[PDB]
Symmetry: C2
Subunit: 336 residues, 2 copies
């Protein structure tokens, strides 16, 4: 497939599955020591999986769980962040300034920190209590998986996730299913990109546990890496003003969930189908997850969508725009 | 001033100030009875003030305080929303479907509800434990004020807001200061609208306690009421991909705060001034708040910005677009 190497992808899966044990050990140490609140703090694309965690937490736990933009958090402080909190950070490079900053800030206050990053000698890990190795090359799904073993193991220990053992083992067969999903979607990825690569404006709609997917793809891929103008908006909030912008020629790409807010997504689908000639539906329910219990599909869904968009759809956009995904005109190009 | 009636504005202020006592009484009854968590649940523009409350709560209280989109909340439920919670709702009409729905859902479960709305016989108030009359004509600042007396009175009772008595009395002189701010800004409102009313795309940037202002103005005024395409993005997150879209000819309107995240806004200001010829800065620090202690300016700031944008800037956009702010092509025009 264009812009894909199966060996690299399966190497990534093996490396992340090899970190399951460490993620579970960190979870167990956090639970056994005790904690007040869990703060998932990051910036940019690494927030997406954390916003999915927050959405799962809303339903599944009474524990205090928060997701925070790390620059806002270090400026404001937070009255619920205290010496018994655990702050979870994640950075592909291990150097991301805002993540290193919050980890160092916590360390100076005696607040425990998890660093999910490749190297134990990174600035992020050097500021942390625990390190979970994160050794994939490509795929935001692998960020989700490490966060899932960590978070859902805490919930299991807290008597709030009786299905953990099945979930955690089945999560290991997610990558093999994602590879199949990539193959199924690749032609549609090409069709979408062929049709919309020169669009002046695209509306991107989703929500709840899917919001992170929309948030990341729109800003971190389309805007940052293709210079395409987007309007990301939640399914629920679409009907409270953004809907007025939709018209026959306006692309709207709807990312659907498999949880309890799927009905909110379907409302958008029904409206858009009447108003625009340019509706694209990205529905993870179209993709099999063989060997995975259907009760876990709502949790897996953001990973399914990520593997389609961040990989396949990005590669096909790049094909038609002729704009390398690695170009930046400002980001990290000068001091600001 | 164009599209403004001072008598209506001052009548609104008198009506809202006359509801201070009731807001305080509701706060006192909530505190005296006890509660677990406070959930501020709404949709669309009425979320803005609630998102400011959440941002203040992050710094000022250890109480469990959450802001939720009411449609998402009723679909998902929430494990932290229990029989001792209080759910706060707010609707100008008293009929807003999602707000009435959550209030009725709570009522059926024995969960207490505050309804902030004009009429005691509205569906929203009929589903509620407490009613705070909200009788202004125009001005989102008046939504903020009622929420402020309610929330900050709870914090005072909870030993977390020692300055309450001064704050609550000084809040009564906010409208008189806002009227002066309107007069000061009106010419600039005209200049901004003259320059940008035919813009194909505008970036709108702010954050933390100011995010609601950006969120509301962009979607609920510009998109919904002028059919203008916007990209609202937080100051902190602007630097994690959206920045790549900025160029010489792209309008960026920066709404600044007066709290601890003002530095995040200033980073955007410095970057944008180098990249676009079309930077507009909306800074509430330019506006006097006479008779209000400077320690409260960060709390008042979202109201200052609202009084400028939602009123004056909207009126001047309407002048130049020739598109009545009351036009809708879809919203509430057919069944969806």
């Amino acid at each position: 497939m264009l812009g894909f190497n199966q060996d690299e992808y399966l190497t990534s899966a093996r490396e992340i599955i090899a970190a399951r044990q460490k993620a579970e050990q960190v979870a167990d140490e956090i639970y056994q020591a005790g904690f007040s609140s869990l703060f998932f703090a990051s910036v940019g694309g690494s927030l997406a999986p954390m916003m999915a965690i927050n959405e799962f937490a809303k339903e599944l736990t009474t524990l205090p769980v928060y997701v925070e933009q790390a620059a806002e958090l270090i400026h404001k402080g937070n009255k619920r962040l205290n010496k018994d909190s655990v702050v979870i950070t994640l950075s592909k490079s291990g150097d991301t300034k805002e993540s290193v900053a919050i980890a160092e800030w916590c360390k100076a206050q005696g607040i425990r920190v998890v660093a999910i990053t490749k190297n134990a000698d990174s600035p992020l890990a050097q500021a942390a209590t625990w390190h979970i190795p994160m050794r994939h090359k490509n795929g935001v799904e692998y960020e989700y998986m490490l966060l899932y073993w960590l978070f859902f193991r805490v919930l299991s220990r807290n008597n709030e996730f009786a299905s953990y053992d099945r979930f955690a083992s089945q999560l290991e067969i997610l990558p093999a299913n994602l590879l199949k999903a990539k193959q199924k979607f690749d032609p549609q990825a090409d069709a979408i990109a062929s049709r919309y690569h020169n669009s002046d404006y695209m509306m991107w709609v989703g929500g709840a546990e899917m919001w992170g997917e929309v948030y990341l793809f729109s800003m971190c891929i389309l805007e940052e890496m293709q210079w395409k103008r987007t309007r990301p908006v939640s399914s629920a909030e679409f009907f409270h003003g953004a809907l007025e912008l939709l018209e026959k020629d306006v692309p709207l790409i709807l990312v659907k969930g498999e949880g309890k807010c799927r009905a909110l997504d379907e409302r958008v689908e029904r409206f858009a189908s009447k108003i625009t000639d340019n509706l694209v539906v990205i529905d993870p329910k179209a993709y099999a997850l063989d060997g995975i219990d259907d009760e876990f599909r709502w949790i897996m869904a953001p990973c399914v969508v990520s593997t389609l968009l961040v990989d396949r759809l990005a590669a096909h956009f790049e094909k038609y725009t002729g704009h390398s995904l690695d170009i930046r005109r400002y980001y990290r190009q000068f001091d600001y």
